[PDB]
Structure 1
Amino acid sequence: AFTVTVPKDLYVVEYGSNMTIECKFPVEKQLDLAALIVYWEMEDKNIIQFVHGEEDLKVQHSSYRQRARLLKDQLSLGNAALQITDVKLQDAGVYRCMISYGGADYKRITVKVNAPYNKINQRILVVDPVTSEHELTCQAEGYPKAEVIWTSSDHQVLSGKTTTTNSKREEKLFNVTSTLRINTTTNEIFYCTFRRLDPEENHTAELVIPEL
């Protein structure tokens, strides 16, 4: 009988990427478009309703107008391919594709969206120009949550303090800030590493103590 197949239950996608998620269905020689209905959905938001050879924009959820599309050309090969452009953290969750072509069936697809701690900002300030205590700062945005390990030029761990909040520019992006307050010298090298899981990622910035 009619069943739908999912090549993969789970897509892991980088923030700002293009994404193609697929549901397969059995098709003989020629495709009967007047019988085929494809329906993609997420969190009750209606993404695609393809009926009688066309996507029904009338039923579509507004915030998908220009960014989501079914690949008509793939349908002939029994592939219902939903493409979402510029994938954001909002786009993570469980998607469902229902296909009706003879019988009907539906499957679930999980998207999880990464965001890399690639842009690490840093600040170096002098606390007391007598004791030579410095305040070092690293901050970056990413997903999921990262912890910060501070290491010396000699690869020893130092006690920093991390604060973790939500971003304002994008969405559920974690804003991670860590401060190291230490007595140190000109030309000394410190390293702050952002450590996140899913999948594992260790991203490091380098801070050098300036002059006068």
Structure 2
Amino acid sequence: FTVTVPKDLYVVEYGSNMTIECKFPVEKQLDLAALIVYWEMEDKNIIQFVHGEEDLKVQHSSYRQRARLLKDQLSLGNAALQITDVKLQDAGVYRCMISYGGADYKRITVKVNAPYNKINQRILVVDPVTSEHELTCQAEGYPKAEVIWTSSDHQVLSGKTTTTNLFNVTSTLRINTTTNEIFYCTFRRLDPEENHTAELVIPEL
């Protein structure tokens, strides 16, 4: 009796859905009365499956309403763990243990990437007479990102960035400008360098 994993490394994007496969030999008809399934992640209990019975109250709080064992896959020898809306705390080493006329287990490493690729922008006309505009870009991600404001000719402009807690980074640029002028807000993380940029076009008043 051996449990096998087709992949022991998963790299997943924040907020996505993930199914970790965990295979074990089943001959034709699954004997539910002899099957135990245990999904664990670094002292956190995810799935405690006994002869078809699960009790959601023993599932760790951080996984509640997000982690489930696919019963359809179980019948075919695949103790597949599905995690929806993946978070940063889902990164780690998962252990899937199967008891089914013998017992075995395998480790699966999960990495979660949270890039700043969803930039929310807004442009406010705070004073039409003086043509003063307030440009704001906000994004969530990990790790910490700096925000660089540039003009259309790529000259760096001075804005105000506020970082609070996954990081929530917002930055605001107050500038006197006119319709159709173009500005860029760039969210930059390092080690290694990764950039995500939104283009902001000054609209009609």
Bin of the TM-score, shorter chain as denominator length: 0.7 to 0.9
**Displacement of 1:134:** 7.9
The 2-side partners of 1:160 and 1:62 are apart by: 39
Q: Does structure 2 conserve the Cα–Cα contact (< 8 Å) formed by 1:144 and 1:198? A: no
- After superposition, the Cα gap between the structure-2 partners of 1:74 and 1:157, relative to the gap in structure 1 and judged at 3 Å, is same
How far apart, in 2, do the equivalents of 1:15 and 1:132 lie? 39
Distance 1:185 1:62 in 2: 51
Structure 1, 183-192 or 12-21: larger mean CA deviation:
183-192
Deviation at 1:203, TM superposition (A): 2.7
Deviates more, 1:155-164 or 1:74-83: 155-164
Deviation at 1:97, TM superposition (A): 0.9
Task: Specify whether residues 9 and 157 from structure 1 end up closer, same or farther in structure 2 by C-alpha distance, changes over 3 A only.
Answer: farther
CA distance in 2, matches of 1:104, 1:36: 10
Shift of 1:191: 0.7
- The answer as to whether partners of 1:69 and 1:83 remain within 8 angstroms in 2 is yes
Following TM superposition, by how much is the alpha carbon of 1:196 offset from its aligned partner in structure 2, in angstroms? 4.3
Percent identity over the alignment? 100
SS where residue 203 of structure 1 aligns?
A: strand
The separation in 1 between residues aligned to 2:13 and 2:79, in whole angstroms, is 22
CA distance in 2, matches of 1:202, 1:86: 24
Instruction: Give the Cα–Cα distance (whole angstroms) in 2 for the partners of residues 11 and 35 of structure 1.
Output: 30
More displaced stretch, 61-70 vs 86-95: 61-70
* TM-score, with structure 1 as normaliser: 0.71
* Cα-to-partner distance string for 1:153-180 (whole Å, 9 max, x where unaligned): 12345566655331xxxxxx21223456
User: Separation in 2 of the partners of 1:72 and 1:127?
Assistant: 56
Give 1:68 deviation, angstroms: 2.3
Distance in 1 of aligned mates of 2:97 and 2:3: 8
Q: What whole-Å deviation, never above 9, does each CA across 1:78-118 have from its counterpart, x for those lacking one?
A: 21101122323333322211112233222222333334535
> Are the counterparts in 2 of residues 148 and 193 from structure 1 also a CA contact under 8 Å?
yes
- Residue range with higher mean Cα deviation, 137-146 or 37-46: 137-146
Unmatched segments (≥5 aa) in structure 1: 167-172
- Which has the larger displacement, 180-189 or 13-22? 180-189
* CA displacement at 1:40 relative to structure 2: 0.6
Counterparts of 2:17 and 2:11, CA distance in 1: 12
Give the equivalent residue in structure 1 for 2:56. Answer: 57
Q: How far 1:37 moved relative to its partner? A: 1.2
Q: What TM-score comes out, normalization by structure 2 length?
A: 0.73
Q: Whole-Å Cα distance in 2 between the matches of residues 80 and 26 of structure 1?
A: 11
Instruction: Quote the Cα distance in structure 2 between the aligned partners of 1:200 and 1:64.
Output: 31
- Summarize the Cα distance change of 1:69–1:145 in structure 2 as closer, same or farther, 3 Å threshold: same
Of residues 45-54 and 23-32 in structure 1, the stretch that sits farther from structure 2 once superposed is 23-32
| SS of equivalent to 2:73 | helix
Cα–Cα, structure 1 residues 69 and 156, in superposed 2: closer, same or farther, change >3 Å? same
CA distance in 1, matches of 2:170, 2:134: 13
Secondary structure (helix, strand or coil) at the match of 1:58 reads helix
Is the 1:3–1:104 Cα contact (8 Å) retained in structure 2? yes
Query: For 1:121-166, what per-residue CA distance to the aligned partner results, in whole angstroms no more than 9, with x for missing partners?
Result: 4567899999999875433222333333333212345566655331
